[PDB]
Amino acid sequence: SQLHYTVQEEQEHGTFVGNIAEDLGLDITKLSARGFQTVPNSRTPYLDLNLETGVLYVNEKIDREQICKQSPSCVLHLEVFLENPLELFQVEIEVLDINDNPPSFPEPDLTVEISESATPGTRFPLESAFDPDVGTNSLRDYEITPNSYFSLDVQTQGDGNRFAELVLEKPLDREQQAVHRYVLTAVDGGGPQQQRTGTALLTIRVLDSNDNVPAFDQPVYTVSLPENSPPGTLVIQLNATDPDEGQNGEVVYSFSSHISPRARELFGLSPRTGRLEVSGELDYEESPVYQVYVQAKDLGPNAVPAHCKVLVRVLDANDNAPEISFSTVKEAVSEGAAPGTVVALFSVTDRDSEENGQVQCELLGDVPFRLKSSFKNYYTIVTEAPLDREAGDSYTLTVVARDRGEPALSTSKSIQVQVSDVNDNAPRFSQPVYDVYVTENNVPGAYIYAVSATDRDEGANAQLAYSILECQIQGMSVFTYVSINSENGYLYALRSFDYEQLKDFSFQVEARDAGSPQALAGNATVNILIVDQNDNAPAIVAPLPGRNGTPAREVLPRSAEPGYLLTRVAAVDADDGENARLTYSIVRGNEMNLFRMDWRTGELRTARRVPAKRDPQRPYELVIEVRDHGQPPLSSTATLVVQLVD
Ligand SMILES: *[C@@H]1O[C@H](CO)[C@@H](O[C@@H]2O[C@H](CO)[C@@H](O[C@@H]3O[C@H](CO)[C@@H](O)[C@H](O)[C@@H]3O)[C@H](O)[C@H]2NC(C)=O)[C@H](O)[C@H]1NC(C)=O
Ligand SMILES: *[C@@H]1O[C@H](CO)[C@@H](O[C@@H]2O[C@H](CO)[C@@H](O)[C@H](O)[C@H]2NC(C)=O)[C@H](O)[C@H]1NC(C)=O
Ligand SMILES: *[C@H]1O[C@H](CO)[C@@H](O)[C@H](O)[C@@H]1O
Ligand SMILES: *[C@H]1O[C@H](CO)[C@@H](O)[C@H](O)[C@@H]1O
Ligand SMILES: *[C@H]1O[C@H](CO)[C@@H](O)[C@H](O)[C@@H]1O
Ligand SMILES: [Ca+2]
Ligand SMILES: [Ca+2]
Ligand SMILES: [Ca+2]
Ligand SMILES: [Ca+2]
Ligand SMILES: [Ca+2]
Ligand SMILES: [Ca+2]
Ligand SMILES: [Ca+2]
Ligand SMILES: [Ca+2]
Ligand SMILES: [Ca+2]
Ligand SMILES: [Ca+2]
Ligand SMILES: [Ca+2]
Ligand SMILES: [Ca+2]
Ligand SMILES: [Ca+2]
Ligand SMILES: [Ca+2]
Ligand SMILES: [Ca+2]
Ligand SMILES: [Cl-]
Ligand code: NA
């Protein structure tokens, strides 16, 4: 027949399986005679048959998962036989499955990826666990640690196969939590029959998507910089936040097309740092404030640009020095132009602003001009005090304009004002009065003297012409004696002067200047004094001579003594001084010192008596010399007759 038994797996060595002999009705000891034996090819290492008793034992521990591997039916087929008579028997030992194996996952560490943009209700398949046992001891269910985000959907397909699924219950946000960690378990149907459990650690990667745009913490930024800030100066460090992952979170900055081209020139913006710096010259005088239209953009797909605006206020700095500009200037200023006469006009500018653009002026020199201002920054240069061309030839006026910044800026400009001349000085003569000494009987048409004169003014106003002012001299005109060279001022004699008739005269000589508005002139006086010269000869006036060129006869008494006075000779000279001094002498007529005559007087007196002489026929006859003491010395002589009457 069919012999049947049932036994569990993993039974101990020696476990009772079944008594073949008893189930077949053959007594214990008759078995040995009949050749009770196991067919050789049907022997299994798992079963050992005791030939003496007919009882089956487990010989090697049976592992159902090793012999059948998930087969629904696990039967071991053995065969036994007896001899005389021959009897063959099939023996089926059905192996039963026990829950000695838990379910297991091929990957104990599992990772599934989900976009943070996943719609709830979406399902995400999962690794199926494997339980090598069969039937009620195989895979029974999946469990996930309780959470809000995911649930488990277990589906059975018939086929006794149970595989799992994830169910997203709520929307994910990678920006809040990008990694989720849950425990995944699978349990079998073991209910010591008890349940076994398997595990897989579950990790959700949350995928990113460009669901955030770059964000400026302000829509408008305002920064103030000083003008002339050096290129490279930090304007502002812009910042557009994007918490996304990777390129979706990388931001790049640029200028929006709204920006003015000028600001594009003057500003540079590093597209990756967002640093906005100066790349030109900030000229407050060109514009005081600039608009920078910036846009940021993330490098993810479907990128949407963000915007912002930086307003740069330029601070004014003192970088423009004042400029001076004369409207009109004149160099022609008269000396007699009263104080207040205008000489020049000018205006000042400073293209700065605020206190940097205010200008104050000073005139340099401590000179006879003042600055006057009606409207500020419009000026006049005027005369302070009266001018004197004779004291000031020209002038150099330098104006200095200086602004009210720090550092202050100053400019200077010079104009030269030439002092014009007026005929306001009268000529003066080298001397108030001159002394001219002229020889008697001089040369007519001769240079006798020279006069000088000087005038302080300029050119014509000091060009001199000389004159002899008309007067009267010896009953007629003064031009009869002297003429003046109207250019040189020379005094010339025109006639030979006779000291005896005229000896001195005086004329007022004049010098006029070439004055066009009003001629000016001065005068002086010249005294012509006349040297006397011995041109008159002396002549005797006493004693009076005879009729017709006949000597004077003065009687000497021969009866007379030494020192006896005869008479005195008097002469005359029309000259003056040593030219009319008079001395007297005798050359011939005296005999051995018989007579004597005085140097100055001309007195004849006897030196000695008349020895050896008594009224001789031939009387004595002297010759007397009258002389003056000038050069040339002139003389005149006379004859005397001394007759002897006692
Ligand atoms: C540009 O913008 C970014 C983002 O706004 C600024 O990042 C700032 O960075 C500091 C320093 O890393 C952050 O402080 C951090 O705090 C955490 C505490 O959670 C700490 O773990 C870190 O060690 C660090 O101390 C700060 O939160 C963050 N600021 C903001 C508003 O998020 C960056 O500073 C900006 N740069 C410029 C030049 O503007
Ligand atoms: C020659 O020059 C003298 C010096 O300038 C003249 O003297 C002046 O004469 C005026 C005319 O009356 C007087 O008012 C002034 O007081 C005089 N000046 C001085 C300094 O005393 C003089 O008049 C001139 N001669 C002539 C003929 O005109
Ligand atoms: C398998 O084992 C786990 C404990 O590790 C249980 O939670 C489960 O019910 C089954 O007994
Ligand atoms: C898998 O393993 C975990 C521990 O990692 C158990 O807690 C669970 O019951 C299953 O046996
Ligand atoms: C008068 O005459 C005498 C001579 O008689 C001269 O010597 C003198 O020089 C003057 O002419
Ligand atoms: Ca087993
Ligand atoms: Ca088993
Ligand atoms: Ca199992
Ligand atoms: Ca998000
Ligand atoms: Ca994102
Ligand atoms: Ca982004
Ligand atoms: Ca400037
Ligand atoms: Ca300026
Ligand atoms: Ca200035
Ligand atoms: Ca003058
Ligand atoms: Ca003058
Ligand atoms: Ca003059
Ligand atoms: Ca004479
Ligand atoms: Ca004379
Ligand atoms: Ca004489
Ligand atoms: Cl004369
Ligand atoms: Na849930």
mmCIF file with all atom_site columns, C-alpha atoms and ligand atoms in Angstrom, residues 9-10 63-65 96-101 132-134 137, ligand 7:
data_model
loop_
_atom_site.group_PDB
_atom_site.id
_atom_site.type_symbol
_atom_site.label_atom_id
_atom_site.label_alt_id
_atom_site.label_comp_id
_atom_site.label_asym_id
_atom_site.label_entity_id
_atom_site.label_seq_id
_atom_site.pdbx_PDB_ins_code
_atom_site.Cartn_x
_atom_site.Cartn_y
_atom_site.Cartn_z
_atom_site.occupancy
_atom_site.B_iso_or_equiv
_atom_site.pdbx_formal_charge
_atom_site.auth_seq_id
_atom_site.auth_comp_id
_atom_site.auth_asym_id
_atom_site.auth_atom_id
_atom_site.pdbx_PDB_model_num
ATOM   1  C  CA . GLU A 1 9   ? 11.669 20.185 9.700  1.00 0.00 ? 9   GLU A CA 1
ATOM   2  C  CA . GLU A 1 10  ? 14.708 20.942 11.865 1.00 0.00 ? 10  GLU A CA 1
ATOM   3  C  CA . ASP A 1 63  ? 16.031 21.708 6.601  1.00 0.00 ? 63  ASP A CA 1
ATOM   4  C  CA . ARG A 1 64  ? 12.874 22.166 4.528  1.00 0.00 ? 64  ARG A CA 1
ATOM   5  C  CA . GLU A 1 65  ? 14.188 25.393 3.000  1.00 0.00 ? 65  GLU A CA 1
ATOM   6  C  CA . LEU A 1 96  ? 6.065  20.221 7.404  1.00 0.00 ? 96  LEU A CA 1
ATOM   7  C  CA . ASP A 1 97  ? 7.197  23.846 7.372  1.00 0.00 ? 97  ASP A CA 1
ATOM   8  C  CA . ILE A 1 98  ? 7.929  25.658 10.635 1.00 0.00 ? 98  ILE A CA 1
ATOM   9  C  CA . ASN A 1 99  ? 8.498  29.387 11.091 1.00 0.00 ? 99  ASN A CA 1
ATOM   10 C  CA . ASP A 1 100 ? 12.250 29.283 11.665 1.00 0.00 ? 100 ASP A CA 1
ATOM   11 C  CA . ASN A 1 101 ? 12.930 31.986 9.046  1.00 0.00 ? 101 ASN A CA 1
ATOM   12 C  CA . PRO A 1 132 ? 11.588 31.349 2.578  1.00 0.00 ? 132 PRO A CA 1
ATOM   13 C  CA . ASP A 1 133 ? 8.818  29.621 4.527  1.00 0.00 ? 133 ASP A CA 1
ATOM   14 C  CA . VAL A 1 134 ? 5.577  28.706 2.739  1.00 0.00 ? 134 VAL A CA 1
ATOM   15 C  CA . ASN A 1 137 ? 4.600  31.246 7.672  1.00 0.00 ? 137 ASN A CA 1
HETATM 16 CA CA . CA  B 2 .   ? 10.729 26.890 7.725  1.00 0.00 ? 7   CA  B CA 1
#
